Structure formats: C-alpha cells, structure tokens
Design a protein around this ligand. Sequence first.
Ligand code: NA
Ligand code: NA
Lengths: 389, 389, 257, 257
Amino acid sequence: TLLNPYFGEFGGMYVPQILMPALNQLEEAFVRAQKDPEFQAQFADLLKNYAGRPTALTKCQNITAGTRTTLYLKREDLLHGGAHTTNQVLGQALLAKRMGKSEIIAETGAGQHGVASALASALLGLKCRIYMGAKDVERQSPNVFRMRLMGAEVIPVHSGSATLKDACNEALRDWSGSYETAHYMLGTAAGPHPYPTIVREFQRMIGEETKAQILDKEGRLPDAVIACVGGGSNAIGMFADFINDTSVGLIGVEPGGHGIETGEHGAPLKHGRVGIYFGMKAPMMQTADGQIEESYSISAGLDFPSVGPQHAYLNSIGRADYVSITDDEALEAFKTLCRHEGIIPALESSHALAHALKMMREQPEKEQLLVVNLSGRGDKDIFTVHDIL
Amino acid sequence: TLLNPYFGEFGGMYVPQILMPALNQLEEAFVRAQKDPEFQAQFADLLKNYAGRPTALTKCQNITAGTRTTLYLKREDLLHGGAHTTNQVLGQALLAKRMGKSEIIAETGAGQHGVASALASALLGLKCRIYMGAKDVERQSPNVFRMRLMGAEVIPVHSGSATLKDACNEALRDWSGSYETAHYMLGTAAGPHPYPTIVREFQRMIGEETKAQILDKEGRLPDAVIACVGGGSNAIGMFADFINDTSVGLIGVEPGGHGIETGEHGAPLKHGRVGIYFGMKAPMMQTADGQIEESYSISAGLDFPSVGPQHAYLNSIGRADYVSITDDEALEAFKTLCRHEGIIPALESSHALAHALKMMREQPEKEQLLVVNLSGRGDKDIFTVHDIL
Amino acid sequence: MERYENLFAQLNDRREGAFVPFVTLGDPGIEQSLKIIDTLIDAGADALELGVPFSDPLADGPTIQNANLRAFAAGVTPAQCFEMLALIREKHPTIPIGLLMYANLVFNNGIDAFYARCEQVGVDSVLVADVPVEESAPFRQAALRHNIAPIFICPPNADDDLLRQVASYGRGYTYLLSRSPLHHLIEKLKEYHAAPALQGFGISSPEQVSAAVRAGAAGAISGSAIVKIIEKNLASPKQMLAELRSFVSAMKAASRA
Amino acid sequence: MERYENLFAQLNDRREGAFVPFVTLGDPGIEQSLKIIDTLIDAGADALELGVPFSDPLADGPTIQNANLRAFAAGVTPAQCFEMLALIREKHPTIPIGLLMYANLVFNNGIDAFYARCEQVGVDSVLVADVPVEESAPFRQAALRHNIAPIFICPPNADDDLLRQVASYGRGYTYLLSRSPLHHLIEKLKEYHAAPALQGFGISSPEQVSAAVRAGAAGAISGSAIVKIIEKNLASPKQMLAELRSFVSAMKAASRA
Ligand code: NA
Ligand code: NA
C-alpha cells in the first residue's frame, strides 16, 4: 500500500482475498485524485454550489446564560440533505467516476447515508443500490421513500439481525462480485483501509472551516470541539484540523443508551473489546465468545456496533477523550436547543450537545469556548420525540 | 403616511379605525429601522450566522439536456427552517423589539410561516401565539409539533371555513386589542400598508444575491426569473432587484389546481376579481355576491385566496407576467427534480419549476438563461406525493 | 339622513335617550328575522342597526360570527337582505334604519350603485366596518350623493385629528366605542359639531343606558346583547320573542332617565 | 499437517482425487450433526471441512448463512464445537479435519491460544475466511508453532505476486476458487511448489469432480451442495442421511476417474 493501513494497532485490511484488488485500486485512485487540482476544483464546486458550503458557525445566545461558557454550533444541519453525510458522498461519487465505475453500492442504518448516496448518484448519474436491514427499512419509511424518489434501489436485509450490521455484510458480499463496475460507498470512517482515511479527508472541511471561523469571530482557538461518534466520520471531520493544535481538546460522545450498567448502549470504544470485523481491527460490541452484537441508542444513526480505528487510536495515546451520553440526556438537550435557540437538532447530534451542557452546568464559573458539531437536523426525529413525549 | 400605501390602484389600509394607530407606529419604526446602520448590521448578522445566507445558486446539470436552456435554482430550500419565510420573520422580530413589543401574533396556512415565527421568537425571546385554521392544524401535525417544541402557542380557528382565511381574521381581531404589547408578524407581502412594503424589503436579498451570483457565473443577467405566488413574498423578494432591469422577464406562477375551467384553483390575480379584504384592495377568490372563497391547490402553502397588491400592479402595467400551473404539472416537476438533480423541492416551488420546464420543452432550440426561486424543501411533502403515487 | 335628525329632535323634547338594537338580518331565518324586528320596534327600539351576513367579519366577535353562520345556513344573501329591508320600511315608515357592512359587499357591484339601492329601499345610514376615515372618500361621497348618512366609529384610542375628521365627515350619529375621558370625548365631539354620539361600547343592562345618557351620549347601541337572546332561545321561538320584548322595554325605560 | 501429506500420498498411489465435503458444525443440531459427519465419512469423504457458526459471515452465501442460523438456534457455541471435534477425532483417527473460521473467533481468546486448542483437539488445518495473505503473519506463525496447516484461498482474480505468496505460506492444501486459465493456475502453483490444490469453486456433480482431477487439481471441495441436502430434508432425518450417503458415493466414485 501507498499509505499506512494502521493507526497504532487498529485498522488493517481484514477482508477475503478476493476484495484486495478492489481496495488497492481505490487507494491508488484516491492518492492520484488527492494530487489532482482538477479533482480538488470539481469537489469544491459541488460542495459550494450544490451542497451549500461553507456552513455557518452559530454562537448560542440563550443556552449559556448565567454561565461563563461560550458555545458555537457548526451547522452541518444546513447542508443539502440535512447532515454532514453529504460531504464525503460527493468526493466518493467523483472518485467512482475517475475509476470509470457506473454503479454505487451503499449501506445505511438510519437512512441519512442512504439518502445522501441516492442524491449524489442522481446528480452524477450512477445507478445506486442500498442495503438496509429489513428492521431499519421498516421504521425508516420516510427516508426509504426519499431514496426511491431519487431513483435508488433499496434492498432490505433479512439475514442475521436485519440491522445495520447485516446491511454492511450484504454490501461487502455484493462488491465482491461486482467491484469492476461498482464502487462501494461506505458510510463512516471505518471498515478496511483505505476507507477510514478517505472518509476523513472528504470530511475535513468541517474542522478546517470551524478553525477559520472561530479565529475570525473570537480571535482564538476553542478550548474543546465536541461531536457524536457512531462510526466516526463527523467527529473525525471536525477533529482532523485540530489534531496538531495541542491546546484544543477533542471530545467524542458515544451513545450510553439506557446506561452503560444496563448493557444496552452503543459505546464500544470505551465499553467494548477489540475484535476483527467489517475488515478492521478495532473496538466492538461482542459477546464473551466473540459474536458481534448491535449498538442500542434512541438515536437511529449511532447504530454502528464498532467505531473507526483512528478514534480507537486517538483515545489510546490520550489525544482525544471519549464520553457517553444516555437517551434521557440526549432528549433533554434536544428540547433545550429547540426552545432556546430555535434549532431542531438531530437526536444523534443531541448527544454531543448534551455533553457540552453537562460541561457548562457542572462548572458554571469556568470560562470556556466550546464548539459542538451539529451533524444533522432533527426533522426526521420529531415523530419519535413526539411519541416519547 | 410617510410612504405610499398604493401600487397603482391596489393596496391601501382597509382596516377598522381602531387598528390605524398600530399601522402608523409600524410604518414609522420601519422607516427609522431602514435608515439605522445598527439595525441593518444586526439583521445581516442573523441572516448570515444563523439562517445561512447567502444561499447557493445551483446550475441544473441533467434536466435541460437536449435543450438550449440553462436553468439555475436559487436555493432558499437551504435556509434554516427550510424555506424563504425565515428571512422576513427575522427582520420583523427585530423591528418588534425596536418598538419595545414582547409578544408576537402570526397566522399560518401550510405551517412554514408558523414554524419560522416560532423559531425567531424562541431565539430573540418573544412570546408567540399562532392562529391556524383547525382544518389546517388537523393535517399539518408535523409543523404543529415543530411549533410547540419551539414553545409557541398554537390556536386552531374553528370559525368560517377553519382555513387560512379564518386564521388571518382571528389574528387581526387579536392585534386589535393587544397591539400595545404585541406585534402582528403577517406571513406574506399582502394585507394593509405597510406590510406589502416591509415583507418585500426584508425578502429582497433573494434577488440581490441572485443578480450578483448570475453575473459572476454567466457574466450576464437572466432572461427570466420565475417564482410561485401564494400571497407573493418569495416572488417579490426575487423580483425586486430586477424591476429596473427591463431586459429581464418576471414570471409568477399561481396554482391552477385541478385546472382553471374546473373552478378549483387558487389563481385570483389572473382569474379572480378585485375586492376589499384583509385590509387591502386587490384581486381575490370570491362569489358573484362578494363572499370570500378559498384558494384550492395540491400545495398547502399557495392557499392565500388573494395576492399582494404590488403583484396585481406589476401585471397591470405589463412589467411582470402571471401564469398558472396545475396540480399534475407540479407533481411531475417534483419527481423530475428528485430523480435528475437529487433535490426534493417543496410542492409550492414545484409550480415555478413546472413552468420553466414548460418553457424549455415547448421551444427546445431557443437559447435562454432561466432562474427558478426554489422557495422551500419538500421533506414536508413526501407523505402527500407518496399517497398520490 | 332626515329620519335621524327628526328622531333626535323628538327625544330632546322629551328629554330621553335613544335605544338602538343590533340584529343580523335573516338570523335565524328570514321569517323568524322579520318577526324579531317587529318585536324590537314594538317593544320600543328608537332605531335599528342591521347587519348583512359577510363571510369574513374580521371586525366582529364570536356572537356576531355565529349570527352570520346561522343566516348563511338559512340561505340569506345580500339580495334577500334588500328585499327584507323594503318590507320593514313599508311597515315602519318613520324608524331610522342603519346598515353595518363590510367594504367588499359595498364594493362588489360598484360603490355608487350600492348606495343607490340603499336609497331606493329606504335605508338611512351605512357604517362600513373596515373603512377607516383615511380611506372613506369614495364611500362618503357616494353616500352624500344618495342622501345616506355615512356613520363613523370613534375608537377609545382616538386622537384630536381623528375627532376633527369624524366630526366633519359623519352624519346621522357618531358611533362611540370602547375597546376592551369619554365625558371629554363626548365633549370634544359636541365642540367640533359632530353628529349626536351613540355609546356602542358594551350596553347590556338598563344601568349602562342611563349612564350613557348621563355621560352626554344621545343614547346607546346594544351591539350583541340581542344576538345573545336569539342564541339562548334558538330552542323556543315564542320564548325568544318574549325575552326580547322584555329586554327592550327594560333598556328603553332606562333611557328616559 | 501430517494427516494431509499422508492422504495425498495414498490417493496418488491409487491415482484418484480427494473428495472433501463442507458441513456446518451443529447444523441442524448437535446429535444430528455428529450423525451427519459419520455418514459422510462412511459414504466416502477423504477429508472434512467444518465451519464454526459465526454471527456475521461476511464471506458466505445464503445457504451457508442459513446453516449458521439453524446451529445458533440449536444453541451451538464455539466451545461446544471443540467438544464435538474431539469426539470426531476419537472415532476417526486418520481423516484430515480442517476448520473454516472468521478472524474474530480466532482472535477472541488470543491467536496462539486458539491454535493450541486446535492442536490439542486434533484439527489439521485452519482457513480464516477474512484474513488475506497480506495480514496473515500472526495467524500463520501461531499455526506453524502448533503444527496446524494455514490454508489460503487462491481467487479467480489472483496475480503472480499472490501465487508466489500462497505457494510459500500455505500448507496442507491450496484452496482454489472461482468467482461467479485454471490449468495455468494449477500449473503456476505446481511450478512454485504450492500445496496440492483442491478446486472449491462450485462442485455439485460428479461431472465436476472428474474435471477438477483432470484439470490438475488434487481433488475438489463441495462447498454447499451438502448444506443443500440437509436443508431439503430437514423434514425427514432418515431421508436426510440416505441422500447424503448417496451423494457422497456419487462424488467420490467420480474422483477415482
Ligand atoms: Na459505534
Ligand atoms: Na394567492
């Protein structure tokens, strides 16, 4: 390989031998794209004229009142498609074309990535098939329809748990036999090398923009940048540019679900064991005898039962800290943002918001400049929060 | 009055004597605000750091293939709240504060304006009450919830037809007795002076931005700018800056519903009679004996049974042209945009898109640069189009 | 306009105030409506104020909103209203009849034409609920041309400039409101030579009629108190007339004093 | 590793190919499973390839996916698998036993520890479905240290560099695939001194066994053809053994030739 597949001891290429040629081809294309100014130029055009970049950096007005905390929200909820997922899906669809592929395979859990794959495909003219656990399809109707309207073929997975886990397996099986014509548009900064590297590099404008934006508005870097962690791409797009700014804290928030103690959560990075699955070596949700398990969370999109290897790595060296937020705490951060700032956040992003609220409420007299990555909008969640309320 | 309340013969202040003092106070405040650089500065900050301006101008890739037409979409669908309604609601909420008011009254049909009033109120800290015909509340649940989450009080109107007409009456009755503490945040560029002028001036950045954007990308002004017309604010925000550019065509599209001939439409500007109602003299939907009637359309937001007076005026002098688009044509433009460009447009905005598609399809060899105002996103409509399909 | 002038002259000579009931034409039905008006008159009403059902009474309250509903549900139309008006006039040649209208019903078939039919049917004044003094020109000119008194509302929030305009443009009577020093208002009106003021605020008890007359008002208009009874007795029509009869005698007796 | 060496030596001396069935341990139950393996052997299997149920067989197809399901539904666990393996070995001392595993089950309790239990229970080789040659180091080293043959898959899309690596790192046999000139592959393997090649592609008829042996393969692995019968006869267990018996005799007879 041209690049290193490992982050410390996490990462690798744990796939059947038949898929190695596809991974090598993808890595080469990526390195070449990355050096191509004509590629850079086309990616940027789409991000700006189509998706809506740069996204705003909103200073909160009312939520930090009575506190010495200043909170800024990076508004990825204002991105075309309604979430950060759109950034990377565009660079991947362009890379697919550069390799002469004409088909796209994507896996989706909550449906956000699915939707983003469909829109990118519709626009750049690729045929798109989406695997979605049949359980997910079943209660993700709104996003399903949205996918079909854009002309994508949705394939429900009935095998295993009929959940995201099962959708990612089906997508790998498929790519096995069709990788000469199809490109696998994986959804997060996980799976086999070079995906953790590609998804991060196509998600790094988040953090690059946040940095420039905050220096302009506060004349200084933030004390901490916080982001939810399902598989890790919004978190790594936000953190990337700050990694060398050692004064800046990096906090990732995993779903605590009903509470760690209950066993019903989705926080493998901090509460699971390293294993090998989905083509990588990283922390995951598994039984004592090594069977992979599902991640539980009120938020549909923090369902990946493992996490990206660069995250498992940033934790190990102490560069970034990972915390968990429970269902109840995310629901409360959802309601507070709505009523005080007039922004409906995605329940996923509510986990990161719940954590910044905890930082300011516990130490109200501590002066701190925080930035929360608002990964998506919460329109898709009003029914849930509704039926919770 | 400081300004003229009439556009040619349309307009005026047709309200009970008790409300004149409120209208005069509002006009003065507006003129003063308009001259205040500190006001301009604060309005701009919110538009940019909170709402997400400037919005992109997207060149369509695939829909004009095989044609000599170039189509650009002004992406108001990328605005915080999901529609153009957010622009004006912010300048009105700021003007309300400038007058020392602490309450907000708003009327809403489809719920977009209602939602935008709630978010602006939540953010700037005003108490907000919303009148919505009980029929509208009943099948606008999603937006209702959204309004209540943001802390707005929703009041269903059971009187009359329990539709938008009835909601606008209830809001005027209310403002009658509470105008000393409350500000009426009217939803469109209609009603009594100075509302048609205020809503247009707080919606004019659409067109100002489009102009700058198109000169930058095409080095020339468009041949025509097209926008749907329910009461008239997106259309007038788009057209305003082009009015003096006589080479540029201005096209407004009213809902044809089931077809003019059927009588079930919502196109009063072209198919109704001038009357006096809602405080203005303009074209409206009425019976032969002068009773006001409702506007019918598949799109929930093009329900205002009259139209703004500056529109009735631009038509009369031949400066702008008004056309109608039926339900079926809007549904087809909805599906085409989805599948070819990956953008779910609001069914309202689909009326304007249906019309540009008709222009290019009828004269495929005519070279023309068109701009469509995409007033909102269509997430709110997937169920409808769904159940239609 | 004459009928008013005459009325106010007689009341003065018998130092008593005017009692004016408001009713919705064709509420709850055509015939029940005519029956109701004959009772009001009989019971002692000095004048009448009648409303023509309008679809969007953006200046009325629920009691009045429900009255239009019942009329509409009855099939009452503006045209049917003008027929009923001609019958009332034919039975009661001297009572002043005023109409409470919405701008659109006036404007529908032409402003001038509307006041012409008013004149022909024998109506004495018209109050257009949604035309402020600032926009009344075409309305007042057409009214004067057809010998119709243009009535204006004097609101609680009224200033001097307005007092001045209302005194100058109105005829028949000044409609005095109160929004939920009047002696000064009444005073200021008198000073500017405004038409007699009728207190319309919220007259529902004999008590208030007497106070209006004492305050300086030439009488009082009972805005929905009457719509109330019809409502309460929708159920028993005979019980409906009986309560109305009584109420009016009650209110009228208190104007004397 | 020995058991393979020995097998291939005997087959050669009787110029015949190897017939190797694939079955899922504990499918459709523990006892029915042991009963099935005794029948395969009895019927003529030259070796065995057994799978340990894994939750996410990202490298298997539906037939095999359903097999893990039934095993799981049976309560089969890896531990129960090692018990069954010890029993098979105890009844059949000479047949080579190979395991088809997923990286995670190998890695769970330590790589070295996993090959140690393999060694202790008497397994001869292990194929890790999701470890390409590029990442096999720790896996192959632990295997060699425990006298376990590390099996590698040679894919259709295989190049020279890979041919070279597979020939050098593998032992027991080379797993030859076909993804939905082999004579050259087989050729190239032989040239590089790779372990005997077993055609695993899609053997389901005696016809294909004979062709594999003719192509140059040392025999063939019947990947799911066997899982198929269990499936078809889930219904009648006695009918299940009977069809298996027959199928194996059928396939084995065709290896001879
Ligand atoms: Na995760
Ligand atoms: Na309209």
